[model samples]
Target chain A: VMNRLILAMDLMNRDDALRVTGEVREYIDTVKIGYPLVLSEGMDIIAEFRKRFGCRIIADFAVADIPETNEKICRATFKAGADAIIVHGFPGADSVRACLNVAEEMGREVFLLTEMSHPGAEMFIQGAADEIARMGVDLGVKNYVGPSTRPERLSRLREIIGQDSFLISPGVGAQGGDPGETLRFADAIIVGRSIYLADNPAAAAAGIIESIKDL
Target chain B: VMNRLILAMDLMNRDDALRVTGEVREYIDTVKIGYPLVLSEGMDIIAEFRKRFGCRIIADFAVADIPETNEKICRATFKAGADAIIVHGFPGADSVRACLNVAEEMGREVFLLTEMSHPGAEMFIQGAADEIARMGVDLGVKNYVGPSTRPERLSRLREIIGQDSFLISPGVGAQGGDPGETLRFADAIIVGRSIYLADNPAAAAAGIIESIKDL
Candidate 1:
């Protein structure tokens, strides 16, 4: 089970990242590893996390390349032990499709990042978010990443993808959003800095779970 | 100074990537390193290419993430010795600004990718290409990447970015793009498989250069 809290393990080094994730192991069974950690360490870090904690690793590379290059990235990430890889939808159907092809071949998953949590997101990603989500649906994508900070938009995204697709929301706690509210739409909420930066990651994570207990 | 050509070193392994790039080094002083090669070998490959060929490395990450994570990815990439990093404008200005801020701080550069060369690209990227270029101009971006496969779109992107900014076009040769025509709008042409996949990379590079010698 995901425990409804996916740790956005964006730390640089392996030691601190692993130690912190282990610290909050009781509340998190899925970890979202991004470029900061992978670039700083290596793809081998994904295998290490899986071996040490039995966690599902979502390699958040935000893959936004041509189809050929996207295939290579997906293959490498899945081979390195990532259960899923986050890809961008704005690159067009060919690019996202390339990832999906590799995912099926490798028996992993692909999470399409529709819109992000930031001020400038309204400038572009927000405008095209709906269409991108539609493209994902047309292409048979079942998992996606949307922003938690904007619940209204998240709800609409939920509507577009329907209830069947696995929707995960970030921008929780750290960017100012409630887990209970986000859970209204997202199956799981990705918490990063608020949990990872806390003195007691376990307590911080537990606090979130406690807050959303009734939901 | 760029030799009007950039080797898109997308090979998965270090030995072949380095060997191929080295073979074509005489015709290219710039190399566009993507995730396929970087993820396969490591970010350390940037430093390896630099030390071996004394070439300028453009980390073609096509970075698309939220602002916070974007900054972290940029820092790690620049620290790895990438002369410049390619960032996607689709994530909105906030995400692109994240890379720009880090580039300015580290004394490197950021190239805004407006349009790509692929069938699916015509779906989202082509539609928003001009607006993205305008946003890049408003954000004071000095470099950009456009699709060589669509010279008209590339020209439109160039018109928006202006003659002062540096523009590079991909989709050349391998993707049915002419280097000479793309060079008319792009300051440099990024050629990947046409050269790297050749049994004799040096001869392939020479052939392209010879075809464009008059220009």
Candidate 2:
């Protein structure tokens, strides 16, 4: 049973991101600062979440750049207070190595984007997920972002990545992925909109947590 | 002939980026604020360059996300004072449309990342460059990014994207791309390290500008 839940703070407004964090901080193991929030509020937003909620931060900028560029990006995101940063494998090995080098030095984490949750992601990312995953493994990456909306792919990724590495799934709740179904393959669940938009954000989060708590 | 030379300010330090921009401002037509610089600094970096150099700014983010998220990102990048942005066509049509809609509304520009300058970029992007270029044209984008290092592919891209759509090439100078050869297919050239790392940055930029001024 996957028990860890990460709140996807994809809100454009700083106040809304902070509000959702305050509402559900107790339930979530970590908070993911999405691209929109990072652009809207700046990197300081990561520090803000760390100070306010005392939770781990994942800078979900989906970093995709050349090796040298990625090194700087990984360093900046880590320095800004992210425990983990998501990198895209589209740029290939050197870029991934750059991110891994920074993360290894900082004692932080790097999560490679294998298969994303969105429908359009299937058009490009799905076919290349295994190749990307294999490259990350060879480069020593131990965490990956997989899709919760597709269980077979999730299970397939788990098989390819093996048991030592962890899988984080996105697209539960508002994106139509079931927690029970996704937890069967993923090590953790990443939830956006559903909890943040709920009338009672904490209760909504708690329900998801409860659904997976007992396996 | 590549009449337009765009400076790629992909530095992590603000002073370095500004110094290069100030030194080479007279020779280059535009300045591209790369992902590292944007992450290390902020979107306001775009505004700072605009205020300082009065040159057109291209936010080289290579944005790849879902349509809704891409729309928000496009809006934010354009709002932050960029005259244009680089978006990846990996997520297919809807994502490209979202970016196009924002750029069209703001009267800004969108450059589709059909092919990248880095060597590893070929593994994922090169095979699909024409398809991506076609998708961008169908959705109304006219500017594109192709590799200066590969003249044959650049010419192929030119043939596929039509004469109306313009091509911007990177990988010049330090990346081993010949300006004269690249200019045969591309409308403009984007150079980074060669000028910025040169002992006399202005002179280096002037040399490239002179080489491409008439052919």
Candidate 3:
């Protein structure tokens, strides 16, 4: 359902966020919503995107909590109509299991965010990223979130999770990652500001898609 | 400022959550509200809690995201009247810095969540807990969140952050942490189910306070 291009709708307003997404609806079938939009407009916005564009919504909460609290977040998010919830594996196996358990019961998906895309990630997350990916594999995690900023990291992550698992990458465009380069490994590349903040969001999405069309 | 007790209000309902919090209001002047209640009742509930109980609301978001998105989440959280927001140190420095920058600009606080209080924490989180604590100290972070489940770990974390910095520990009550012993290291302790789910929340808070009152 990704269509290989997930609009990271990070804008913090309802009208502008929706209007921008509507502009690029034809080019994307899946939308990645985060705390910016959700906290500003509310979780009902997940349902709004589904109803408006018939797009699959991935709630990129980057959920990091103790198991007890993780369960509540996944349940409430799924109830609000998110197809999948992005969770952090750094909290350990139990926290990840909590999300996985909730997703299995709710008929939703949990995308474990292993390696992140940021300059600061090198300090700690990068060190544990591999172990987390391995842990995810052992736990039978079917989906993951990785950084597109480094193809080698994504490749190594792919090796750990293997080919059958679905992996998504962020850090394209605004963060200096190439769309086509990231797709060699990721099932979908999550792009935010490059589209949402663009002078013409539709053209920006179309441009990115055109570059990756052959892939 | 803590009064040594911060309520981890994880209830999923607004009426019940508010009722229980109000019951223990005198015993606790600070509350740790998390996604369970925020997602269920909406962010306005933070404002309601501040208004009703006159308590300092710490949004236990355990924020984990890329820098750009983390900034937005912190901005929105501060806008919602949170005295502080709990952010994960596992995501690395940039994500945590994004929150710190926003908190500084907004005149709020950011609590670095280092070692968590859960059995799952031993898997991967334990290995990285020390580095994350050091990172927090290097970042000039003045506040932290640790596990009360183990006084040794909390004491070790205090050693990393030093005595001047404020540290709060969760895992008491429902998670099997000891309040009196936890106070040996932590400036304050976070309690949830043991108080909120109790038949008489006020008595629960009072009893807990009594146990640690000698400190």
Query: What is the CAPRI rating of model 1's predicted complex?
Result: high
Candidate 1, residue B54: the lDDT equals 98
Tens-place lDDT per residue, model 3, A1-215, is 44699999999989999899999999989999989998988888999899999999999888888899999999999999999999998888999999999999999899999988998888778888999999999999999999999899999999999999999999999899998889999999999999989999989988998888877
lDDT per residue as tens, model 1, B56-154? 999999898888888998999999999999999987888998999999999999999998898888887787889999999999999999999999888
Restricted to chain B, the TM-score per model reads: 0.98, 0.95, 0.98
Question: B87-179 in candidate 3: lDDT tens per residue?
Answer: 989878888889999999999999999989999888778888999999999898999999999789999999999999999999999989999
Report how far residue A63 has shifted in candidate 1, in Å: 1.0
- Cα lDDT, all candidates: 0.91, 0.85, 0.91
> Which stretch of 10 consecutive residues in model 1 chain B shows the poorest summed lDDT?
B1-10
Model 2 lDDT, residue A98, Cα:
88
The candidate with the higher DockQ, 2 or 3, is 3
For model 2, the docking class works out as medium
In model 1, state the lDDT of residue B73: 89
Query: Which candidate comes out best when scored by DockQ?
Result: 3
